[PDB]
Write a sequence for this structure.
RNA sequence: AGCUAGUUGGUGGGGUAAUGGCCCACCAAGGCGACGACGGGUAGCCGGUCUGAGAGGAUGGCCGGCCACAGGGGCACUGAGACACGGGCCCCACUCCUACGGGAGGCAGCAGUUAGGAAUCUUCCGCAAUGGGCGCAAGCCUGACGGAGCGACGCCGCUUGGAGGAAGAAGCCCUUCGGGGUGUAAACUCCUGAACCCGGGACGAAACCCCCGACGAGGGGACUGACGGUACCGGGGUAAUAGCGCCGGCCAACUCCGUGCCAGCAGCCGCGGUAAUACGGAGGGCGCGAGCGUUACCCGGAUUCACUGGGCGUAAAGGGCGUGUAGGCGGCCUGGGGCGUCCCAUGUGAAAGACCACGGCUCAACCGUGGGGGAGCGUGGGAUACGCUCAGGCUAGACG
């Protein structure tokens, strides 16, 4: 299936995560469909995490089933919140 | 690693004053004045005509010594300069100057470049809040260096300040002599620095 | 957009099959000069409607045989057999230089 | 000549001659020294030059030069081969690297020790 | 067989320049004429004209020459130092807008055959259309 | 570093106290028989110790070696022109505590006109390098307790070198007694 | 270091051999390949098969020596 | 240099998720080839990397994709998907037991063992993060991964002090005997304080979980650390590893002793046979520096395979000539078509890199964010100068 998931890049002890859309059976670094956002765990930057919302929503609609952490991140950003 | 070891010998080798001690390297003592010739035996000998390569090499060495850096680092800096657009020589020089130690030396925080570097290493030198201990720290313009909180009451620093009390600083620099502060303002151009080095020769040497 | 090609019917020696010479003029990747370079394609003709010495429009298609992956779209112009003749001559020459 | 000609046949790319067959372009091949002997050099040069017929891990029976002021090499000595020619000697393309296996370091070297594999002298 | 006409014309021009002859006569072509016009505009030649020698249409070319150089090797100075047919037949070079040459860094000129007509390097750049790099002229 | 310890019963042991025979895996080189095993705080220290030991031993060995071809004018000549021909042999045993024994046994068995020579004596399996060495030297490969690897054995067979495999020391000794010959 | 471990033995020249070298039958033993001294070459001392010359043998290989003394 | 016999096409059927010579029956006799087939060798391929002014040239390590193989070969089964790395069956090869009838195996997973070999790590800790799978869930599993260990194997960062301080100690070295060199180097004064010890001490980890809200959005709660008591901060606190190459020209840097075409060096010219700026040492220098040199390969220089940008009277090089096939190439004008060619637009050209900008790790490497570029390739439109093609004419080529 298709998942919204976090791809580790970066350095040892300096992790960086790509909030990304990809197939379930892939390398956690692998050929992903689209880069929707990015997240730094270490909170080192002011704009530490950011995801484009509309694209994410579209993906969800299509049926992109997110990872739990990813979902949390999305919620934090303001994707799942509706009015 | 540093050069480490005998200093004014290098100056002697070039034949132009290199100011690698500050004082004494100012007085009749740098060995430029007492003896002006290259070191070791055949220094006082007949000076033979040097090859085109050789002169350039000498110039490069002079430069490196003046800035007190490892060759690899120097090479890297040069490469970076080349990559950046402008005047590959002047820009390179500016970049070199931007080395924290050099800046410190200029601001009269320490009377010698090696001394300045040492000071920087031993947490005595602070760049906008944090004590920075690596002289390879490159400073981008409009930025503040200061003698550290807990190093403000040490004798050497005071002496340095006194020495630089009265005598003025470079146009790219400003220093607060009261509170041991020093802003690096402009990025230092070649015209500002009346250095004995010719950058062109260095560039040529590097080329091939 | 299926690959649509221009070429001449060089051989009708088999049932339902037309052999088509497609001549492509591409420049050399290094020397910058155009090489008039040919390739043979075996095309499906369900009627034998097409004949020796016809220039036709050949479409990339779903396969009908092992290297017969082309449908014949339409006939462009019929009777410029000169090219065919040239090809034949070339073929004949190919026989010569064996032993 | 003409570009057309080139197109037709192409420039025959230079098959660069492999100057040393220590196999694979291996930097160092270990060899068993078959027979160590001395050699008369060439027309412009004269010396009893020290050499060893060494057989290899590859299966190659070669001649190999011994640098150093007097060898230590036996008759079934374990050696490591440098390669890099000698302009004097016929059939000989290999240095023997001194300071390994059974070729011990040159005694009483103090300047160019690295090439000949002798350890730092203990100063007084 | 005269195998390239443009190239031949160029060669003739070069020969004329070498020899210090004021005017030469090259066979008639529209393309050739255009090229000549371009050259004239640039200033590389003094002028051009079409005439008829025998019963064949022909193109007279007025060669421009520099002032007499005083002293050793007393020849006048050359205006067309060098010409080259770049787009040689069966080699035929074509350039895009990005690959337009600034030959002699703005001093020498290339002439380009283009969709928008036969035209100069500068003109090509302005118009933003690549084409056939027929001839290098300096 | 200790990888595995296994008693004589055939059981895996994670912990072994004072006085138990353990099959200790984890030594980078095969240590000598009756070698005193010692504990170290870290690895670097151990390495340093090893280096020091090597320095102590190796230098001395070198020195010992060096006082042998003293005179090269006449003595060397005497030593190069050999009257009684020597037989070369290269041994490979199963343990350190058998190879030595074998050597001791065969050092006596040398009174004959043909004098036996040991060029390479190590514990373990024969290989193609060994075969190569034999070819170079005209030497025999003898094995006690260790069977030859298949490839190695094949190589030995085809190249034409003496390959030997044994069950008892006595057998080996007997075999050796045939190698001096007589011609007449 | 410079190792003078060389045999300086007498020999009669026997065979006219290659590369400024003469097979000389030794009184220490065999006929070897022993080549001329550079000094001799410089002086242009011509040698015939039948001179009682001194040979400098190096013990590493007794194959090659050196014709040192003038006859 | 010819290759082909399911081989090339057909009709019918089988088989497939599906086309197809994938397979079979039958008819036909084709198909490919010098625009290089078939054969041999070689080789995973690329995104890239290294080099290079560029064009190119070499390489495909790590990282990313795709393929292929899981001792060798063959073949199916089950399923969404395998012809199935830690499933199956079978033959062979090999190792392992056997009560000789038979079974067990497969590290090209991590670690490790050997063996080859110049040479390559730890039988490490952890599910904490991310991801995987299963599960309502907790949670279980995870040699993916996160980290730690070893190796100067790369690359980067810092230390081996700094400031004084002789018209110049000793030591050593040369000298023309005055002197010079090492060298402000040292010693010695002053100052700082890696190491080191204490005191604390992380970011990374906020969720899934529970409760309120409808099990939605939303609100609060709590737990959860291999790295690691590490990084890092606060206090103290020692002056605290310098080595290697070379020093005749290239090529930076020179003297003396010893040696005597010997011993040696050498990458090339070549140095060495009694005053060697080329050998051994010593001083002195110079290059770099926790490294430096040697070796091996690759590119460069090498415009020594030349497209950009080489030539062929005598250097290596014009075939011995003729006719002629492919092929390549082509006069002038007018008109179309628009294949090349150019252009505009768009789509692609993934990410990582490379480039620019800023930002994080005290700098830098490293990484992150954003941006631009990017040959090529498709699609749509346009342009017709120049090739290409069609049509018409011309007379300078050529032929009669
Ligand atoms: Mg001697
Ligand atoms: Zn000074």
């Amino acid at each position: 299936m298709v998942k919204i998931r976090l791809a580790r890049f970066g350095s040892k002890h300096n992790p960086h995560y790509r909030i990304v859309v990809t197939d379930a059976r892939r390398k956690r670094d692998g050929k992903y469909i689209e880069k929707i956002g990015y997240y730094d765990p270490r909170k080192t930057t002011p704009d530490w995490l950011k995801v484009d919302v509309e694209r994410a929503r579209y993906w969800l609609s299509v049926g992109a089933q997110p990872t739990d952490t990813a979902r949390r991140l999305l919620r934090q950003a303001g994707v799942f919140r509706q009015e | 690693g540093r050069y480490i070891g005998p200093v004014c010998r290098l100056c002697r080798r070039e034949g132009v004053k290199l100011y690698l001690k500050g004082e004494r390297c100012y007085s009749p003592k740098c060995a430029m004045e007492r003896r002006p010739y290259p070191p070791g035996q055949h220094g006082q000998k007949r000076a033979r005509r040097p090859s085109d390569y050789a002169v350039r090499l000498r110039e490069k060495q002079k430069l490196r010594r003046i800035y007190g850096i490892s060759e690899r680092q120097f090479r890297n800096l040069f490469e970076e300069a080349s990559k950046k657009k402008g005047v590959t020589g002047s820009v390179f020089l500016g970049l070199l100057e931007s080395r924290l130690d050099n800046v410190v030396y200029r601001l009269g925080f320490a009377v010698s470049r090696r001394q300045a570097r040492q000071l920087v290493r031993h947490g005595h030198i602070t760049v906008n809040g944090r004590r920075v201990d690596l002289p390879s720290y490159r400073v981008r313009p409009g930025d503040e260096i200061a003698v550290a909180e807990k190093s403000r009451n040490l004798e050497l620093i005071r002496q340095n300040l006194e020495a630089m009390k009265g005598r003025k600083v470079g146009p790219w620099l400003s220093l607060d002599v009261e509170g041991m502060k020093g802003k690096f303002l402009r990025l230092p151009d070649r015209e500002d620095l009346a250095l004995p080095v010719n950058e062109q020769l260095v560039i040529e040497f590097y080329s091939r | 957009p299926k690959k649509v090609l221009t070429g001449v019917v060089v051989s009708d020696k088999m049932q339902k099959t037309v052999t088509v010479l497609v001549e492509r003029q591409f420049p050399h990747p290094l020397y910058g000069k155009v090489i008039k370079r040919s390739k043979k394609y075996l095309a499906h003709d369900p009627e034998e409607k097409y004949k020796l010495g016809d220039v036709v429009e050949i479409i990339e298609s779903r396969p009908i045989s092992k290297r017969k992956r082309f449908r014949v779209l339409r006939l462009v112009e019929s009777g410029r057999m000169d090219l065919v003749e040239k090809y034949l001559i070339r073929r004949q020459n190919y026989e010569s230089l064996s032993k | 000549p003409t570009i057309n000609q080139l197109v037709r046949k192409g420039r025959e790319k230079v098959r660069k001659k492999s100057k040393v067959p220590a196999l694979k372009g291996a930097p160092f091949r270990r060899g068993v020294c078959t027979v160590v002997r001395t050699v008369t050099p060439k027309k412009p040069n004269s010396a009893l030059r020290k050499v060893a017929k060494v057989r290899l891990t590859s299966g190659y029976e070669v001649t190999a030069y011994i640098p150093g002021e007097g060898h230590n090499l036996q008759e079934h000595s374990v050696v490591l081969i440098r390669g890099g020619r000698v302009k004097d000697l016929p059939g000989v393309r290999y240095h023997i690297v001194r300071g390994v296996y059974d070729a011990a370091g040159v005694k009483d070297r103090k300047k160019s020790r690295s090439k000949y594999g002798t350890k730092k002298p203990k100063e007084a | 067989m005269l195998t390239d006409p443009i190239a031949d014309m160029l060669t003739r021009i070069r020969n004329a320049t070498r020899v210090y002859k004021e005017s030469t006569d090259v066979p008639a072509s529209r393309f050739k004429e255009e090229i000549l016009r371009i050259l004239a505009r640039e200033g590389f030649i003094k002028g051009y004209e079409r005439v008829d020698v025998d019963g064949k249409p022909y193109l007279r070319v007025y060669l421009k020459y520099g002032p007499r150089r005083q002293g050793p090797d007393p020849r006048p100075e050359q205006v067309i130092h060098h010409i080259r047919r770049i787009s040689k037949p069966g080699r035929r070079v074509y350039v895009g807008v990005k690959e337009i040459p600034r030959v002699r860094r703005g001093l020498g000129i290339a002439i380009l055959s283009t969709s928008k007509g036969v035209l100069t390097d500068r003109e090509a750049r302005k118009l933003g259309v690549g084409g056939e790099l027929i001839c290098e002229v300096w | 570093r200790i990888r595995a310890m296994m008693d004589a019963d055939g059981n895996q042991r994670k912990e072994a106290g004072p006085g138990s025979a353990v099959q200790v895996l984890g030594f980078q080189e095969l240590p000598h028989a009756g070698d005193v095993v010692e504990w170290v705080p870290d690895l670097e220290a151990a390495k340093e110790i090893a280096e020091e030991r090597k320095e102590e031993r190796k230098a001395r060995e070198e020195e010992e070696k060096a006082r042998r071809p003293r005179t090269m004018a006449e003595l060397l000549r005497a030593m190069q022109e050999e009257g009684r021909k020597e037989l070369n042999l290269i041994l490979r045993a199963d343990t350190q505590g058998s190879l030595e024994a074998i050597q001791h046994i065969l050092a006596r068995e040398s009174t004959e006109d043909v004098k036996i020579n040991i060029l390479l004596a190590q514990v373990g399996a024969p290989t193609e390098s060994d075969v190569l060495l034999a070819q170079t030297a005209n030497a025999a490969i003898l094995a006690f307790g260790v069977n030859p690897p298949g490839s190695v054995k094949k190589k030995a067979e085809e190249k034409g070198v003496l390959l030997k495999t044994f069950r008892i020391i006595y057998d080996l000794v007997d075999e050796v007694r045939n190698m001096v010959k007589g011609q007449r | 270091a410079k190792e003078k471990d060389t045999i300086r033995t007498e020999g009669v020249v026997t065979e006219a051999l290659p590369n400024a070298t003469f097979r000389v039958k030794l009184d220490s033993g065999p006929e070897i390949l022993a080549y001329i001294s550079g000094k001799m070459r410089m002086h242009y001392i011509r040698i015939l098969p039948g001179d009682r010359v001194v040979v400098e043998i190096t013990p590493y290989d007794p194959t090659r020596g050196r014709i040192v003394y003038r006859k």
About this structure: Strands of chain D lie at 29-39, 49-56, 61-65, 78-81, 92-95. Residues 5 and 11 of chain D are 10 Å apart (CA to CA).
